Each structure stands twice: as C-alpha cells, then as structure tokens.
Amino acid sequence: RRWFHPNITGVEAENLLLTRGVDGSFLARPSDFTLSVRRNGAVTHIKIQNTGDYYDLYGGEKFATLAKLVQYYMEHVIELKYPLNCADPTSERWFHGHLSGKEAEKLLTEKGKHGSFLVRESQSHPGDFVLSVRTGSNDGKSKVTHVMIRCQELKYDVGGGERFDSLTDLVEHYKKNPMVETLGTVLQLKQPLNTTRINAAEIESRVRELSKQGFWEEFETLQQQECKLLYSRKEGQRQENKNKNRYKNILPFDHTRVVLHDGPVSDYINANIIMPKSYIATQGCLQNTVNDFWRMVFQENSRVIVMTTKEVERGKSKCVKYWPDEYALKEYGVMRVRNVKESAAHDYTLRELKLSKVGQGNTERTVWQYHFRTWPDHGVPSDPGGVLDFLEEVHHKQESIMDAGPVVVHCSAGIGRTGTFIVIDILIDIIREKGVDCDIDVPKTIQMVRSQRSGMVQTEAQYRFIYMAVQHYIETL
Ligand SMILES: CC1(N)CCN(c2cnc(-c3cccc(Cl)c3Cl)c(N)n2)CC1
C-alpha cells in the first residue's frame, strides 16, 4: 500500500515515474483519484471516480477499494508491474508532524499504554525528527522515552547503524528489531498512540479542529489500513455465483457472509453479518436474487429493512422492486409477501410487509420496510437531521420486536451509503444508552465494520457526514 502518494501534483508524479522509476512502474493519488502509469518511456494518467457507491476506473471495472483495483490489474494494453513507493508520513497513524515535547508527553500520559509510540517534527534540533515511546498514572512504573531521529541527505537514522529512505522504513524496522536501552529497557513499538478516540461530549471541539483539511488527513490514514482487511472472497468468484453479484469485483468476505440454508450452490447471497443489535449489509436486488433476498430475511428472522436508495437514480436501476404493490400479495419462490399498508413521511416511505414460508401459516411475521428517499444522487445530505430522525424511528421499531434478527441495510453495491447509515447507527446507539459520557472513535468503528464488509464508508463526504451526524445527535440530546 506504499504505491499511494497523497500530497503530490501531476508534475511531481511525472518526474518520479520518468526518473526514479522504469517502464511498468505506477502510482495512485487524489487530483476523485488518478492512476499514473509508465508506458514506453512516458507517463499515462487514468481517472478513478468515487460517487459514494464504489471506485470506478474509466474503461476498467468497478471496485470496493483502491487496493483491490490495483491488485486486480496486477494480474489482468496498460500494464501494472512495479509500484513506485511513497516516502511521505502524512497518512501514517504514528506521525504527528508539528508537535511539541510537552504536547507529546501530555498525550502519551493521558492516552498511552505499553509500547504506545509516535513520531513528530523535532522541537529543538532543526529539520530532524523525534520518536516518543511509552514503556510500562503517577507511580513511576511507566516512562516516556525520546529517541532522536537525524535527517541527513534525504535519509533517516537514530544516531547510528542503518540509514533509512523514509520514517516508515525506520519505524517498521525498530518495530521488528526493538532498540534496547543501556540498562536493558526494551523500547517496543507495540502500537501507535490513539488520538482519534474522543469523548462523546467533546465532539463540537473535535469537529472544529478537523474542519481547519483535518477530515481529509484522518480519512486517508484509514484508507492506508485497507490492505490489512483484504480477507478472502472465494465464494463470490465460484462460477454459479458470478451472476448473483451486482458488481463481479465487489464481493462479500467468506467469514462474515450470509449462508442460505433453505436449499447446486443455493447458499449464496452478496450480503454480510455486521456485528459491532446486528445488521445485514447487502446490495440492491437483481432479478435472479429477489427470491434469495426473501430467503435471507426469513432465515435470519429480520423484521426491519433499511433501503438507503431509490428504485431508479440518474436513469439507471439502483435496486429492483422486490416488494408487492400496496394491498397486493406476491410469491417470491417459497416466500409469500403481503404489502399491508404504505405510510409516507417527508424523508422516507414505510411499507408494512408480512413475510411467511409457502405452506406454513404460523411462519408469518411483520417486516417493516424503511425506504429512505431524500439522499442526493451525488454526495451527502446538507443537514443530518432527516437521517438521524429516520434511524431513531428504525431503532425504536427494532427494539419493540421481541427476538428480532439483524436490521437489513441496502443501497446499490451495499458498501458506501449502506456503511454510512450502519456506522452512524452504531455510534448513535452508544450515545443513546451509555449517555454523553462515553468514548467515541469514528475511524476505529469504521475499520471494525470494514473488517466485516469490504469498502464500508466510501468517501470523505460520508466520513465528514458521520461526524456531523454524531455532533447533531449530541447537540439535540
Ligand atoms: C496526523 C495523522 N498522521 C493523521 C490522522 N490521524 C489518525 C490516527 N489514527 C487513525 C485511526 C484510528 C483508529 C483506527 C484506525 Cl484503522 C485509524 Cl487509521 C486515523 N484515521 N487518523 C492522526 C495522525
């Protein structure tokens, strides 16, 4: 994941490839994203677009993450051979750039644990760097240790030994080969210092700091961590399952996927169980998946569905109508759905459905369909009010039903908009019950969700929207 450079211009990108690279060499960067590839001694740039639903390469295919886009094309003309590595530490969890000695010690004391480390721009020595580690309150059993990093001729060192190309090289080297103190203190770089974990009550202050862009820096630092969540999706690739996918490359992880037990390969659905109240993050239905969608709802005993998109957007199908018309009755394979009544609110439409297995009478249960419909075609809503009110209603309908299964959430690919609502709900559920006095970490919760379904929360727009949604809920609490 060293191939992504987040702070360079197309001119800098052209030099790098033509001078410090060869034919086949590549790199990605924001300009939307740009894929700069080297072909026959020349740089060829490519557009990568993200609407908030998926990653789109012009002429290429639709992907859940930037890492899988690069991975798919490093085996499948424009050739992707040698990634050109970035030496910039901006997108690194441990880097805190312009930071003071006491400001660093303050954070390592307040939030630090054993092996909690961070790198900063040297206060005293000009142009150099500082590695601060906490090995282990007021008992003196734990201590802060300052290791000077000398910057000389575009290379980094800790006063001796090897000279590294980037701070990233140095950090990853002393993480594997820890520095031993003169009296034997092992300077373990166990994990970087947590800074994103903030109290629920101090959200207005944190947003104010992130608005200074702070949200962009924090968002790409989380995108850097996506290569750590590249878990197997073997089932989605199986011949008989390729048609059951909206997008052949946006597949559910094998470990979290929903396995259909109803009964060749009738067990597949492009869906995942999200366990932080549980959820099912799925895509919009296809003609050949409608019956499977109802087989899932039945099996997992789901009583609430959250539709985050319209049936048709910008002239194309975002989710096929899988529910019968008002007052009508329909059979979807072995399932029978009755649209009891539709009630329209301003931001949504609620559909009271009655799902049951064909042949069995007591198998009937009410499935409340919440269809959100004021989400813009491109981007995120201006105000989080409508979304929050919707989710508040969804929670209380879910809470009212005894032994209810997971809340089914779905948009187009079921990763972007689906992920935004699920993350907003998980965070809002904490503040609801565990009050305003609890710790809220937005990128940790996203990463936890992303471990369960690829690409959950697609854009910086949605990332910021999650903070603005959380802030509002507290401000009105
Ligand atoms: C200036 C800086 N280098 C960029 C922003 N920044 C951070 C830090 N940590 C996360 C984080 C937190 C929990 C889980 C995961 Cl996976 C991640 Cl990545 C984050 N998103 N941004 C602070 C340092």
Kindly report the number of other CB atoms within 10 A of residue 91's CB atom: 22
DSSP 464: H
Q: How far apart are CA 331 and CA 267, in angstroms?
A: 20
Reference 374, options 387, 393, 391, 392; nearest CA is 387
Kindly report the number of other CB atoms within 10 A of residue 340's CB atom: 14
CA of 379 to the centre of ligand 1 (A): 23
Reference 390, options 367, 375, 370, 404; nearest CA is 370
CA of 416 to the centre of ligand 1 (A): 20
Which residue reads 């565990």 in tokens? 434
CA of 331 to the centre of ligand 1 (A): 49
Ligand 1 in reach of 218 Cβ (< 6 A): yes
CA distances from 338 to 69, 350, 370, 398 (A): 42, 14, 15, 20
Q: How far apart are CA 448 and CA 156, in angstroms?
A: 33
Ligand 1 in reach of 459 Cβ (< 6 A): no
Q: How far apart are CA 90 and CA 172, in angstroms?
A: 16
Phi and psi dihedrals of 65, rounded to 5?
A: -135, 160
Pairing of strands 365-372, 304-307: parallel
SS (H, E, C) 126-189: CCCEEEEEEECCCCCCCEEEEEEEEEECCEEECCCCCCECCHHHHHHHHHHCCEECCCCCEECC
**Atom from ligand 1 closest to the CA of residue 90:** 3
Ligand 1 in reach of 92 Cβ (< 6 A): yes
- Name the percent of the chain in helix, strand, coil, to the closest 5: 30, 25, 45
31 assigned to a ligand binding site = no
**Helix, strand or coil for residue 416?**
helix
Phi and psi dihedrals of 429, rounded to 5?
A: -65, -35
Q: Do 174 and 156 contact (CB within 8 A), yes or no?
A: no
373 assigned to a ligand binding site = no
CA of 221 to the centre of ligand 1 (A): 5
Ligand 1 in reach of 217 Cβ (< 6 A): yes
DSSP strand E in 2-94: where?
26-30, 33-38, 43-50, 55-57, 62-63
Which residue has the least CA distance to atom 21 on ligand 1? 218
Q: Do 319 and 385 contact (CB within 8 A), yes or no?
A: no
CA of 222 to the centre of ligand 1 (A): 6
Q: In terms of C-beta distances under 8 Å and separation of at least 24 residues, what long-range contacts does 444-448 make, across chains too? A: 444/196, 444/197, 445/276, 446/222, 446/419, 447/222, 447/225, 447/229, 448/276
DSSP 74: T
DSSP 194: P
Q: How far apart are CA 41 and CA 240, in angstroms?
A: 43
Three-point CA angle 413, 416, 418, nearest 5°: 80
Reference 26, options 40, 8, 45; nearest CA is 45
Which residue has the least CA distance to atom 9 on ligand 1? 93
Ligand 1 in reach of 222 Cβ (< 6 A): yes
DSSP secondary structure string, 198-211? EEGGGHHHHHHHHH
**Atom from ligand 1 closest to the CA of residue 225:** 16
**Atom from ligand 1 closest to the CA of residue 97:** 1
CA of 463 to the centre of ligand 1 (A): 13
Q: Do 75 and 148 contact (CB within 8 A), yes or no?
A: no
CA 70 to chain CA centroid, Å, is: 17
Resolution of the structure in the document, Å:
2.8
Phi and psi dihedrals of 273, rounded to 5?
A: -85, 120
Q: Which of 4, 96, 103, 195 to mutate to test the pocket of ligand 1 (most atoms within 8 A of CB)?
A: 195
417 assigned to a ligand binding site = yes
Q: At what angle do helices 203-211 and 460-475 cross, to 10 degrees?
A: 150
377 assigned to a ligand binding site = yes
Ligand 1 in reach of 7 Cβ (< 6 A): no
Q: How far apart are CA 336 and CA 316, in angstroms?
A: 28
Tell me the technique behind this structure.
X-ray
Q: How far apart are CA 207 and CA 348, in angstroms?
A: 28
Residues 6 or more apart whose CB falls under 8 angstroms from that of 179 comprise 147, 158, 187
Reference 193, options 88, 86, 92, 87; nearest CA is 92
Classify burial at 410, counting beta carbons within 10 Å of its beta carbon; exposed 0-12, middle 13-18, buried 19 or more: buried
Ligand 1 in reach of 121 Cβ (< 6 A): no
To the query of whether residue 319 is one of the catalytic residues in this protein, the response is no
Q: How far apart are CA 33 and CA 6, in angstroms?
A: 10
Q: Which of 196, 206, 215, 445 to mutate to test the pocket of ligand 1 (most atoms within 8 A of CB)?
A: 196
428 assigned to a ligand binding site = no
Alpha helix segments (H runs only) across 192-345: 203-211, 214-223, 234-237, 290-299
Reference 454, options 66, 92, 34, 80; nearest CA is 66
Three-point CA angle 11, 9, 173, nearest 5°: 110
* All structural domains of the chain: 1-91 (3.30.505.10), 92-192 (3.30.505.10), 193-477 (3.90.190.10)
